[PDB]
Design a protein around this ligand. Sequence first.
Ligand SMILES: O=C1N2C=C(c3ccc(O)cc3)N[C@@H](Cc3ccccc3)C2=N[C@@]1(Cc1ccc(Br)cc1)OO
Length: 187
Amino acid sequence: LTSDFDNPRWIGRHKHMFNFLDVNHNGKISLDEMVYKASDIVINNLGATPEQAKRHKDAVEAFFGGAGMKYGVETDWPAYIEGWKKLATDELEKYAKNEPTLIRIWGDALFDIVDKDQNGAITLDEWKAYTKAAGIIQSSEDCEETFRVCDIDESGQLDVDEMTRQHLGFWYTMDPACEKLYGGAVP
Ligand SMILES: O=C1N2C=C(c3ccc(O)cc3)N[C@@H](Cc3ccccc3)C2=N[C@@]1(Cc1ccc(Br)cc1)OO
């Protein structure tokens, strides 16, 4: 439940993602681009209903919002990483107080789209469909590493509650137990 913001591997994890989000190498990204990307994936690749898409958009907006990003503002790397320090701090504070995190809220919205059974858990094939559409993982072998790192349930599925815990460790705290969550795709 403690952050590790001076760790070069934390900083570099998020710089990897900044660079991945900055698809046209502008050195800056906007909230507009984030919510476009989000809705493009779920509506155009993953079959989301209109209601599901709007729920998902609201969650992504709130997530990057928590990192300081705003509509009509171009966020460069120094502003992006400083805002990520605020997001991670807020998220860990919520998690410690048993309050829903922004990453959980996003997960619930995403999993309602990706889980054909709408019961809060995804198969490996579903995780492959999501991460390859998003681009955050490219290869099947890296998607398969997720399922090695995560505690998989009795039906072979990845529950949103488990992925949220792994995400806290991976994106917010540098928990060694959560290394390689995205395989080699994200250092
Ligand atoms: O955890 C997830 N992330 C985390 C990030 C991320 C990016 C930058 C950064 O500095 C830190 C994290 N990005 C994405 C991909 C994406 C970005 C923007 C719009 C749509 C999709 C992502 N997709 C998710 C979706 C998700 C969310 C919550 C839960 Br629980 C499970 C899955 O899984 O790969």
